[PDB]
Design a protein around this ligand. Structure first.
Ligand SMILES: [Mg+2]
Ligand SMILES: [Mg+2]
Ligand SMILES: [Mg+2]
Ligand SMILES: [Mg+2]
Ligand SMILES: [Mg+2]
Ligand SMILES: [Mg+2]
Ligand SMILES: [Mg+2]
Ligand SMILES: [Mg+2]
Ligand SMILES: [Mg+2]
Ligand SMILES: [Mg+2]
Ligand SMILES: [Mg+2]
Ligand SMILES: [Mg+2]
Ligand SMILES: [Mg+2]
Ligand SMILES: [Mg+2]
Ligand SMILES: [Mg+2]
Ligand SMILES: [Mg+2]
Ligand SMILES: [Mg+2]
Lengths: 75, 65
RNA sequence: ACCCACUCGGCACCUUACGAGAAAUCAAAGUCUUUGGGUUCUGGGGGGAGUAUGGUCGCAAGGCUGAAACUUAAAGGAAUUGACGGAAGGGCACCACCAGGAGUGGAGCCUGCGGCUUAAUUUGACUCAACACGGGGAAACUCACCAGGUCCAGACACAAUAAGGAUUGACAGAUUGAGAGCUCUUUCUUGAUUUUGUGGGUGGUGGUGCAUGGCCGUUCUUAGUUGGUGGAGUGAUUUGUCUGCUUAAUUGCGAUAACGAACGAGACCUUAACCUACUAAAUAGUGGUGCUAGCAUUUGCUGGUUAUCCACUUCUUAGAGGGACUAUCGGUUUCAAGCCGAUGGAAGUUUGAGGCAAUAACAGGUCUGUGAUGCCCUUAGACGUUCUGGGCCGCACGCGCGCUACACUGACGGAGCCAGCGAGUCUAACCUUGGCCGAGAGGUCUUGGUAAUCUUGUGAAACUCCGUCGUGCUGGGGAUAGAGCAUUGUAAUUAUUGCUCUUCAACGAGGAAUUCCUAGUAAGCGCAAGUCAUCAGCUUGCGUUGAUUACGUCCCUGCCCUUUGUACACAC
RNA sequence: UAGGCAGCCCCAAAAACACGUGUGAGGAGAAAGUCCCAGUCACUUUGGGCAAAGUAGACAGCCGCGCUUGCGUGGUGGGACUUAAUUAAUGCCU
């Protein structure tokens, strides 16, 4: 046998490209005149993630992105 | 016949070339009298030993110890 | 008239090769490179072409004479080997026949193939030598087909991306078969571990078996194939290697310009058949019984052991061996090879059966068994892989391998009830005893067996006996379909399969035709094993019961050889 | 009744012209058997081709109908003339 041509009935799909963003410090670190910087978002509260991961905020709830944990903004 | 297993080794081999694969075969029958383990000759090699012809006697010539 | 011996002339003939010839052959075709007796005619590669024209002869038909342009590297002669022949002859073979046996082809179903539909019903193979074959009884996988969804499992080098961060991976909702962040809202994180481009590689049941290897099938399981010396021929080549008889056989006996040899065959190896002769044995048994008990009773049948005994290896097993060599006799035949009959022997068909199996080949099959493969294709929206679903099984039809039946040599029920070949799990759930539940399949707790130990003594069917039926498409037959009960499996839906009930289809001995088969063989019957989680109507092996027929022939088929013919040699 | 176990019952004996029961000129409905047969396409026969034979096969065509221009809806096989069909072959290329 020889293969026939393939003409899909659905259009082509594209892959995820991670958004190259020019921020790593402004999202979590608050500007101070003296220099005492507080964090604006929580870390992995699982026992075996760590305390510097600065999880993914949303409009309604909290997801980590790394430590799999799910929490609440109204805490 | 079983003499092919007793006296003959056989090899086959593929050789790669730019044109294709080549099949080489080598068949070797070594001397059966050098086998020294089991069979000594071919199964149909029937050799009769010499009669050792002796000069016949005429007188009795009894001999005593 | 005949016979004999001569002779001249003639038609021929037989042997030989003096001698010739390319050879076939030739007493001329000899007396020719050692070439000269006399003389006439004819040819100069093959076609064009014995054609055109001219002449001449003829009533005509045509005869005689007779070119050129052009075209071509061969045409041709004799002989050899092979192939082929709708040529002759001789052999062989239940993949041929005779005589028979069982059948298939008829009926229903299982399965393979062709055809049709489809998005797909994947493909390979089409006489023997395709059609229960790819050891292919496919629900996932097998898969290579189709339809969808991801992943790269795209090495390595260079140039960028750029660490003000190349990029992987993401819960949740939507989308999606999907509890795939596949992608959309989102910012979390891993962090030369990536991404893009080129070169280059890799995967591919993608193609090409008419590019190939290996392997297998076939010629051919037939019996054929070679060279040494010598003989023949200028040579290719031939004899040896054969008229005949014999054999399974180029097996031998013989014949004989052949003689002596090699491969094949045979020999050989494995299995089966025998051994009261050897070695033995709680993983095999046997007898008395060290021990014991049962029942019938004055001993028969047993149940339990080897420090709950001893003896032995007949039966069982595997090591070494012996035995068959066609042995003795008779007949026949070249008194040879042999063949046949009888006797004996476990064995007298190569003792039965297989394994290996010569030279030379096929555009035989397989690239889809191979990480065997050249080339080609594809290599990312993949012809790679994976996930989901379906399919290969689709049904107006045809053919083949098969199973079940058409009945009384039977169907069903009860009773007795013997094999052999094998397979087995902790290298995880294999073969299963016992106990219990369940009509049943099946389920529960265990036990023995990693194995001559347990399944297992596989307590098999067929069968033997006793009953029911009594020639009724009937209690022969079980096609098809409905309901449920359980197993294996993620998944039983197109019903995997088993089981209980119910329907009782065609089939009333089957056309042309076609297959296999000579002894523990055909055939009947069952059993174990391949595949397998399950499923065999298939296959590889095993055992039980066990015929009839013939010891032959070339009628048909196919194969081989000899002669013969050929303008064939790629070989009809 | 010849026989069989045979007195029943049971299984089993005995032909030829009617030109005849196979007609007419018979008319008609429904179908079978054949020289000659069928328009294209498929396959089946072949190692493969053709030439011939075959298949309930698709499109036809034909016979008609429907409310028609466009078309659809049904059959989609029908012909003609003989005392039991005989198949002799390979019929020709590659
Ligand atoms: Mg004369
Ligand atoms: Mg010349
Ligand atoms: Mg000339
Ligand atoms: Mg035949
Ligand atoms: Mg016969
Ligand atoms: Mg039959
Ligand atoms: Mg049939
Ligand atoms: Mg597939
Ligand atoms: Mg991906
Ligand atoms: Mg010579
Ligand atoms: Mg010769
Ligand atoms: Mg041999
Ligand atoms: Mg199939
Ligand atoms: Mg047994
Ligand atoms: Mg029945
Ligand atoms: Mg029922
Ligand atoms: Mg001739």
């Amino acid at each position: 046998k020889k293969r026939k041509k393939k003409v899909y009935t659905t259009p082509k799909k594209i892959k995820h490209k991670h958004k190259k963003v020019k921020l790593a410090v402004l999202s979590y670190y608050k500007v101070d005149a003296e220099g005492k910087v507080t964090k604006l978002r929580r870390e992995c509260s699982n026992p075996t993630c760590g305390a510097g991961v600065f999880l993914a905020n949303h409009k309604d709830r909290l997801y980590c992105g790394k430590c799999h944990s799910v929490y609440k903004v109204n805490a | 016949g079983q003499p092919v297993n007793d006296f003959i080794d056989t090899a086959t081999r593929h050789v790669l070339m730019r044109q294709g694969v080549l099949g080489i075969k080598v068949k070797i029958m070594r001397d059966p009298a050098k086998s020294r383990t089991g069979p000594k000759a071919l199964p149909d090699a029937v050799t009769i030993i010499e009669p050792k012809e002796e000069e016949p006697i005429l007188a009795p010539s009894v001999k005593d110890y």
